[PDB]
């Protein structure tokens, strides 16, 4: 339920924050650190986090293989769409769906993005 | 956010099966794929999902580190709550908040494994 979300996601935000600020303050944030870091922010019920974890994903973005890549702007997309900027989370996918065409996720989320725009 | 999170939930289960697979086939899975992939297991909305975590996680318990063994315990205990292995998931979350007495999501958790039992007419 809704409590048990809570809790999971409270247990995990803690460990990737703790985790991030450490690897700052030694000047080494690695990008699975900071992916996970953004992964929770993203789906964060507050947007000062949303805006945080797209941030985030922005800064890895140019750092990253083509592989990582596409992850990066799949919840580049899942992050603009929680913030309401449905324009901009439409382009992350629809260029996500041009490499990957058949990705049944990426489909689906153009869904919802097109129906929360209609 | 009922389907977003399903679109979540297999992006992360697909990306974490294809790097389980591929270890797999070398030899050698280490510790962190094998924990992250039971990790989105036992947060998927299948139950054939939790039962494959939990054995996954079952097999990194004694190889890890204490504080290592600390998040295979928790999700030990998220995943048989999810199953409603009741008495499975009590043992594990009391068995952290022995080392953590001041642990507020173990110590909720115990609750919330409580409630679901009174509801259950345990
Ligand atoms: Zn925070
Ligand atoms: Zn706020
Ligand atoms: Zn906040
Ligand atoms: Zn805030
Ligand atoms: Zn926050
Ligand atoms: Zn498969
Ligand atoms: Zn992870
Ligand atoms: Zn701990
Ligand atoms: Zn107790």
Redesign the pocket.
């Given at each position: 339920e809704a409590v048990l979300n809570e809790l999971v996601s409270v247990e995990d935000?803690l460990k990737f924050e703790k985790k991030f600020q450490s690897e700052k303050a030694a000047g080494s944030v690695s990008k699975s650190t900071q992916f996970e870091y953004a992964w929770c922010?993203v789906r964060?019920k507050?947007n000062?986090?949303i805006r945080k974890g797209i941030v985030l994903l922005e800064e890895l973005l140019p750092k990253g293989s083509k592989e990582e890549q596409r992850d990066y702007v799949f919840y580049l997309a899942v992050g603009n769409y929680r913030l309401k900027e449905y324009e901009k989370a439409l382009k992350y996918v629809r260029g996500l769906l041009q490499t990957e065409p058949q990705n049944n996720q990426a489909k689906e989320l153009e869904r919802l993005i097109d129906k929360a725009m209609k």
């Open positions: 935000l922010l964060s507050y000062d986090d």
